Amino acid sequence: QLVESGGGLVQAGDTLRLSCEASRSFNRMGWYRQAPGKQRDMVAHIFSDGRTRYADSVQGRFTISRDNAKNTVYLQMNNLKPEDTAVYYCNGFFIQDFWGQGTPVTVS
Amino acid sequence: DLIIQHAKKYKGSVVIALLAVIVMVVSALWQPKLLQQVLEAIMNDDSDKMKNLGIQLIAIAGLGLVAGVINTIFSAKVAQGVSADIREATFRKIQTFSFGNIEKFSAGNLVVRLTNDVTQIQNVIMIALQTLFRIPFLFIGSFILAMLTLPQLWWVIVALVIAVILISMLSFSQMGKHFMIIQNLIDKINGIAKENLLGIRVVKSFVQEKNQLSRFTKVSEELTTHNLIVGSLFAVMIPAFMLVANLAVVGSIFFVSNLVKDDPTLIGGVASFMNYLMQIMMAIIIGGMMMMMTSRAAVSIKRIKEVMETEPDVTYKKVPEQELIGSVEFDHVSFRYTLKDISFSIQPGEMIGIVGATGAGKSTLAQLIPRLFDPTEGKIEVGGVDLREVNEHSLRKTVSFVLQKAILFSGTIAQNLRHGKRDASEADMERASGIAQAKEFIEKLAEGYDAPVEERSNNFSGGQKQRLSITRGVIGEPKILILDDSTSALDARSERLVREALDKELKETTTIVIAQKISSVVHADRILVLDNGRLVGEGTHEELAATNPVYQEIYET
Amino acid sequence: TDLIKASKFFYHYLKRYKVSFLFIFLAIFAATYLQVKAPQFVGEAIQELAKYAVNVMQGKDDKSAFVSVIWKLLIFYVLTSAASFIYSILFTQVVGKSTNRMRIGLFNKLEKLTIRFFDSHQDGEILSRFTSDLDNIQNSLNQALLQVLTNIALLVGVLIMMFRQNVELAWATIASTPIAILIAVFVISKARKYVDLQQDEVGKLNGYMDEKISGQRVIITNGLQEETIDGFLEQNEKVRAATYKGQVYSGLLFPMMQGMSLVNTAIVIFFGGWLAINGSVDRAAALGLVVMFVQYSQQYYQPLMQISSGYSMIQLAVTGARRLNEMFDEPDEIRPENGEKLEEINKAVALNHVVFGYNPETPVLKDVSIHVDKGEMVALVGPTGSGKTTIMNLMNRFYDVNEGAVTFDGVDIREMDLDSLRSHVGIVLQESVLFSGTIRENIAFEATDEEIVQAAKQANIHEFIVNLEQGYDTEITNLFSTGQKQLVSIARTIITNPELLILDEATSNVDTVTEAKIQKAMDEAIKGRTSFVIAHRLKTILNADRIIVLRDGEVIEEGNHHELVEQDGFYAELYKNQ
């Protein structure tokens, strides 16, 4: 199981660092999001080694990070725009996609 | 040690061959590790990692493939090199033996241990470089890597190896115990087939062929029981091996579930682990098989060793000698095949004959003048020089000895005649032929002196065989010629001619004549008589006609 | 056609085991089926293990499905072992019995009236026909045939079950088959060629060797060391390249196919991972399929490796089978139940206008017409070896003449039983080879014990038997003198005590004293029986009752020695050697 914290009210241009932790699980992690009425979709992925890959919509702005010492993951929101508003989740899995409850972020 | 002693010559290729073996093994042992890595990445879903590991895996697979060809080719190079070198060395040793050392073994034994064993060891060392060194490193590497990838399963590897070792012990006992006997029986069958076939004339001459068939069928029947036993042994072990391997794999799958709770990545290991487990089982069984087969190699190398090492009976001494004076003398000689207290002397330009009981060393005493035998007690000096003092060069270029049997070699008769003298021109060739009265007979052939001769010389009969032998004896015109009952097979028409020809070339020649036929000996100037290792006396035909009793009971014939 | 001939050869013997040979097919079919679905079950097992793990992440399932699938897999593997047990045992039993049957068959056919085959073919070639070809068949059936059958069954089954499991991944994994088969065909063909060349060259070498290692005595006497070693070294250099090529191409196949298996498992891994990550989202099923297909690739190239390796054995085996079939079609030529069973010659033996030769063209003899009477004997002489020795070959009906008749009393050789004939007439042939066992066996070659003493005394050899250790019980099969072989043969013939005897030049290689002993042995042989004799040393049978002399198989003169010398002729010229 997972746990994520950080989401909340924000403005278009703000910065927010997401932070999720794994229940003793070691995995390749990544963040997903769901816009209201939309499907779950990829946002970014961080490899266990340390290299990553981002979605074009967030390429160049959002940054992901992790600490293998405890398998915790982070994602730095920054330079927000209204369409970024959505509910986001931390994902790390082997076969069936384990994801946490996630948290929403509202870009005012 | 002998094989490596010879292989020092090819160590340069041996090292590269062994390195090829090593690279093949390491590639084969990684590819399941990379299997685990790639399917673990599938578990972890890293596309770029998947691609990189896949390309690495295919590359290493191809690398192992090419390692295989290089390994086999250079292993073959070293194997053939050692085989050729050892065969050459043994051939040299054989050709350097004394006739007694040759008599130490039967000609069939020489040829078999010189041709079958050499190729057997060649194939053995081939498998050794190509395979043997593969098994142990393969086994240890698989063991350690499997322990590393699934440490919690260490015990099951030990259990599997124990079980396979147990069944391999059962095999190593029963299979060998029966293999020896069945090998003997299959050889026995071929032997009886040989004997029956060559005797087919006489076998078909009698209804006993039916009983011979019954005997052969009986023998095959005993062979059948052992063959069935070994078949049962196959049918027990091969299922036994496959069962133990399968049980080990399934147990590996089953028990890993007890520990996945705190670590699921072990799912990644399990497949590579079972692969390694099957690999090590196969490695140990093939190692056992090759170790068992190594016993034949051990026997062959033991057999070749003694022939390689044995020293001759005759040896060089000090300095080359002068030209032979041409005299022969004996000093209380003794020998065991036999002879004792033998003494006599003959001077240049004299002829003497020898006669004794049939089989009582028909020609051995004469054979002693050649140093191929040595006097155990006493001595003989030919030309005033002892056998221990003379050297082989002078003997051949000054003495000759026609054997008790006619011997020819494949090719042309001309080369066989040239055996006696390296540079004997044709002219001397027909001179010797006419001395033996063979010029016209040879002329009757396809070409003549260069005409062909069979390997066994079966295209000429015995009489002309004796004639060719005596020609070979006389071609060198040596000071000393030994004539041994060469007249006992050809037609009773040319004995007078051959003795007469010897009676004109005798100038500066002294010859010893041996035969049970006093008829050919009557022309001898002197005669000596022997009986079962005891010299009877010396004298002449007419004098011995009354002097000794042994004379009469042959003379009456 | 060779394949069909070899198949007929096998069929001729395998017919007598049809039910078992058919039941083994069902056994192996079941075995392969079970061995081929095993990868499916191990893959499903690892899939369910991954499922159990993911449940352990939150649910901690009871692994019940996993346990059930492991149960299935373990039971299937055990039953696979049982199937191997059963078909291996039954196949081994049938192979053993069939091998015994065909070995006895080859022997029995050999002891038919194929005399011509032995007469024509050299001894070495005919012995090879046995010891190479039949032994190759024996080895193939002992270990080769089951491997190929099991492996081909496994191959077809595993192909079918691959295509039942997945389409694209299997259609790709088998894609290495053409490369592997091209490798196998090329390497094996070149290996066949080069190994045959190597065998030829090493045969030449070891023949040179054999002859030299036999004649080394003359070498020592004349010191041929340098020349013989040089020739040996040249032939050794030739065989050096020959055996280098042969050994390399013989041993290359197995490691080459092993590496091909490595690359095959590699490429299947590559596609498996690619499909798993880029294809179906069900990773658990994906990895199960991947491991399953790894197992499949291993179990697929194992058949290919085994069949390719056994190809060398089986091809040479079927060629040897072709040779054995050529033998098995040779006419037996045994005589039928001709009714007449001779019991006594009646002492009216003679020949009638006999024309014969090795082959119809250029007969070696023509119009031979001689007669022999009660306890009488006839002396023969003419051209050396063939031309005169051949008549004896007909006397035992070893061959059969085209036209002309020979009889012992009116009845021609074609009339009576061959067995009765051979029983009533004995023959002594120049070489007079011996047989395994003791000298007692060689004299008996019979249900007689104490007659050996009387015969040996009659053979003037008894002293020699008693001379050796344990007398008659001296094992023999070398270590025996020349004339005594012929003496033993004469003793054998006399214990046979046939009505008629035929003897060749028994004094080929013997001394005058041994010649006289042989002569008194002859006297004993002829004293009680009618007998023919071939003599080149006229002194041997100078006391012949009647004498015959031959041109190139044509009678030119006949009569007593005194008659034939007072009558000018070739006989007197031959005698004039004395």
Dihedral sign, Cα of residue B101, residue B107, residue B110, residue B114: positive
Among A24, B477, B234, B121, smallest CA distance to C90 is for B234
Cα–Cα dist B55/C460, whole Å: 89
**Gap positions in chain B, given as the residue before each gap (C–N > 2.5 A)?**
337
Check CB contact under 8 Å for B50 and C97.
no
- What resolution, expressed in A, was reported for this entry? 4.2
Q: Is the minimum CB–CB distance between A47 and chain B shorter than 8 Å?
A: yes
Q: Which residues of C touch B194 (CB under 8 A)?
A: 127
DSSP for B77-89? HHHHHHHHHHHHH
What is the CATH number assigned to the segment(s) A2-103? 2.60.40.10
Residue B234 DSSP code: H
B260 in the same domain as B334: no
Chain C interface test: which of B21, B33, B50, B72 (most C C-beta within 10 Å): B72
B376 in the same domain as B295: no
Cα–Cα dist C181/C187, whole Å: 10
Q: What is the CATH number of the domain that holds C445?
A: 3.40.50.300
Check CB contact under 8 Å for B370 and C221.
yes
Cα–Cα dist B385/C498, whole Å: 62
Q: What is the CATH number of the domain that holds C87?
A: 1.20.1560.10
How would you classify the pairing of strands B480-484 and A2-5?
unpaired
User: Where among B278, B309, B340 does a domain terminate?
Assistant: B309
Cα–Cα dist C24/A86, whole Å: 69
Given strand A41-46, what is the order of strands in its sheet? A9-10, A103-107, A86-93, A28-34, A41-46, A52-54
Q: Extract the tokens encoding C441.
A: 């066996």
The neighbour count for residue A53, using CB atoms within 10 Å, is: 14
Determine the 3-state secondary structure of B314 from DSSP: coil
Residue among A25, A95, A98 whose CB faces C50 most closely:
A95
Q: Smallest CA–CA separation between A101 and chain C, in Å?
A: 15
C356 in the same domain as C268: no
Q: Extract the tokens encoding C522.
A: 């002859």
The neighbour count for residue C200, using CB atoms within 10 Å, is: 12
Check CB contact under 8 Å for B49 and A47.
yes
Q: What is the CATH number of the domain that holds B447?
A: 3.40.50.300
Q: Is the minimum CB–CB distance between C283 and chain B shorter than 8 Å?
A: yes
Q: Is the minimum CB–CB distance between C247 and chain B shorter than 8 Å?
A: yes
Domain span holding position C520: 350-575
Q: Extract the tokens encoding C432.
A: 């007079």
Residues 252..311 of B with a Cβ closer than 8 Å to A: which?
Answer: 264
Q: Is residue B314 part of a domain?
A: no
Distances (CA, A) of B546 to B94, B528, B542, B555: 48, 14, 7, 11
B181 in the same domain as B284: yes
Q: Is residue C342 part of a domain?
A: no
Check CB contact under 8 Å for C58 and A1.
yes
Cα–Cα dist C552/C547, whole Å: 17
The neighbour count for residue B352, using CB atoms within 10 Å, is: 19
How would you classify the pairing of strands A2-5 and A16-22?
antiparallel
Cα–Cα dist B314/B100, whole Å: 9
Determine the 3-state secondary structure of C74 from DSSP: helix
Domain span holding position B493: 328-555
The neighbour count for residue C27, using CB atoms within 10 Å, is: 21
Q: Smallest CA–CA separation between B263 and chain A, in Å?
A: 9
A24: closest chain C residue by CA: C57
Contact C31, C89 (CB under 8 A): no
C276 in the same domain as C227: yes
Instruction: Tell me how the structure was determined.
Output: cryo-EM
Check CB contact under 8 Å for B115 and C209.
yes
Check CB contact under 8 Å for C256 and B65.
yes
Q: Is the minimum CB–CB distance between A95 and chain C shorter than 8 Å?
A: yes
Q: How many CA atoms lie within 13 A of B251 on its CB side?
A: 17
Cα–Cα dist B277/B285, whole Å: 12
Among C563, C509, C515, smallest CA distance to C540 is for C515
DSSP for A15-84? -EEEEEEESS---EEEEEEE-TTS--EEEEEE-SSS-EEE-GGGTTT-EEEEETTTTEEEEEE-S--GGG
Q: Smallest CA–CA separation between A76 and chain C, in Å?
A: 28
Q: Is residue B323 part of a domain?
A: no
Q: Is the minimum CB–CB distance between C283 and chain A shorter than 8 Å?
A: yes
Q: Is residue B26 part of a domain?
A: yes
Contact B64, B24 (CB under 8 A): yes
**What b/e readout covers A77-107, taking b as 16+ CB neighbours within 10 angstroms?**
beebeeebbbbbbbbbbbbbebbbebbebeb
Residue among A47, A94, A95 whose CB faces B46 most closely:
A47
C436 in the same domain as C292: no
Residues facing B534 on adjacent strands? B531
User: Where among B258, B281, B309 does a domain terminate?
Assistant: B309
Q: Smallest CA–CA separation between C57 and chain A, in Å?
A: 8
Check CB contact under 8 Å for B44 and A95.
no
Q: Extract the tokens encoding C72.
A: 């299935």
User: Where among B281, B309, B337 does a domain terminate?
Assistant: B309
DSSP for C194-232? HHHHHHHHHHHHHHHHHHHHHHHHHHHHHT-HHHHHHHH
Among C238, C310, C452, C264, smallest CA distance to B64 is for C264
DSSP for C231-274? HHHHHHHHHHHHHHHHHHHHHSHHHHHHHHHHHHHHHHHHHHHH
Q: Which residues of A touch B44 (CB under 8 A)?
A: 27-28, 48, 94
Q: Which residues of A touch C58 (CB under 8 A)?
A: 1
Q: At what angle do helices B47-95 and C253-278 cross, to 10 degrees?
A: 180
Chain A interface test: which of B44, B263, B266, B267 (most A C-beta within 10 Å): B44
Task: Give CA angle at C95 (C93, C96), nearest 5°.
Answer: 65
E strands in B117-270: none
What's the domain count of chain C? 2
Q: Smallest CA–CA separation between A81 and chain B, in Å?
A: 30
Show the 3-state SS of B105-124: CCHHHHHHHHHHHHHHHHHH
Q: Is residue C341 part of a domain?
A: no
Q: Is the minimum CB–CB distance between C65 and chain B shorter than 8 Å?
A: no
Cα–Cα dist B7/C225, whole Å: 26
Check CB contact under 8 Å for A28 and B264.
no
**What b/e readout covers C294-303, taking b as 16+ CB neighbours within 10 angstroms?**
bbbbbbbbbb
DSSP for B199-222? THHHHHHSTHHHHHHHHHHHHHHH
Distances (CA, A) of B369 to B381, B480, B538, C368: 9, 10, 18, 54
C281: closest chain A residue by CA: A95
Residue among B43, B232, B358 whose CB faces C92 most closely:
B232
C376 CB-contact burial (10 Å; exposed 0-12 / middle 13-18 / buried 19+): middle
Chain centroid to Cα C436, Å, comes to 19
Q: Locate all alpha helices (DSSP H) within C329-417, ordered by sequence.
A: 389-395
Q: Among all chains, which residue has been given the structure tokens 């119009």?
A: C367
Q: Is residue B72 part of a domain?
A: yes
Q: Smallest CA–CA separation between A14 and chain B, in Å?
A: 32
Q: Max alpha carbon distance in chain A (Å)? A: 37
What's chain C's length in residues? 578
Q: What is the CATH number of the domain that holds B199?
A: 1.20.1560.10
Q: Is the minimum CB–CB distance between A68 and chain B shorter than 8 Å?
A: no
Q: Is residue C105 part of a domain?
A: yes
Chain A interface test: which of C49, C54, C56, C280 (most A C-beta within 10 Å): C54
DSSP for C548-570? EEESSS-EEEEE-HHHHHHS-SH
Distances (CA, A) of B6 to B1, B11, C279: 9, 9, 59
Contact C575, C538 (CB under 8 A): yes
Q: Extract the tokens encoding B420.
A: 């006696």
Task: Please list, in sequence order, all residues whose beta carbon lies within 8 angstroms of the beta carbon of residue C39, skipping any fewer than 6 positions away.
Answer: C291, C292, C293, C295, C296, C299
**What b/e readout covers B436-460, taking b as 16+ CB neighbours within 10 angstroms?**
bbbbebbeeeeebbebebeeebeeb
Residue B29, φ and ψ in degrees, nearest 5: -80, -30
Q: Extract the tokens encoding B185.
A: 């029986």
Cα–Cα dist C129/C118, whole Å: 12
Q: Which residues of C touch A95 (CB under 8 A)?
A: 50, 54, 282-284
Task: Give CA angle at C381 (C377, C382), nearest 5°.
Answer: 155
What's the domain count of chain B? 2
Check CB contact under 8 Å for C277 and B392.
no
Q: At what angle do helices C283-328 and B266-309 cross, to 10 degrees?
A: 30
Check CB contact under 8 Å for C54 and A95.
yes
Q: Max alpha carbon distance in chain B (Å)? A: 118
Q: Tell me which H or E stretch contains C501.
A: strand C500-503
Task: Please list, in sequence order, all residues whose beta carbon lies within 8 angstroms of the beta carbon of residue B128, skipping any fewer than 6 positions away.
Answer: none
C551 in the same domain as C507: yes
Q: Smallest CA–CA separation between B36 and chain C, in Å?
A: 10
Determine the 3-state secondary structure of C12 from DSSP: helix
C358 in the same domain as C323: no
C393 CB-contact burial (10 Å; exposed 0-12 / middle 13-18 / buried 19+): buried
Determine the 3-state secondary structure of B343 from DSSP: strand
Cα–Cα dist B551/C353, whole Å: 52
C142 in the same domain as C6: yes
Amino acid (one-letter) located at B474: V
Distances (CA, A) of C258 to B146, C153, C265: 21, 20, 11
Cα–Cα dist C461/C452, whole Å: 11
Cα–Cα dist C445/C452, whole Å: 11
Amino acid (one-letter) located at C479: L
Q: Which residues of B touch C517 (CB under 8 A)?
A: none
Q: Is the minimum CB–CB distance between C93 and chain B shorter than 8 Å?
A: yes
C139: closest chain B residue by CA: B227
Task: Give CA angle at C295 (C46, B58), nearest 5°.
Answer: 105
Among C355, C390, C348, smallest CA distance to C371 is for C348
Residue A79, φ and ψ in degrees, nearest 5: 55, 60
B352 in the same domain as B209: no
* B vs C: CB pairs below 8 A: 377
Among C439, C442, C431, C530, smallest CA distance to C492 is for C442
C432 in the same domain as C296: no
Write down the number of H helices and E strands in chain B. Answer: 20, 11
Cα–Cα dist B520/B470, whole Å: 15
Q: Tell me which H or E stretch contains C406.
A: strand C403-409
Residue among A28, A93, A94 whose CB faces B46 most closely:
A28
Q: Extract the tokens encoding B73.
A: 């080719």
Q: Is the minimum CB–CB distance between C49 and chain A shorter than 8 Å?
A: no
Cα–Cα dist B479/C494, whole Å: 51
Contact C35, C154 (CB under 8 A): yes
What's chain B's length in residues? 557
* A vs C: CB pairs below 8 A: 14
Contact C452, B230 (CB under 8 A): no
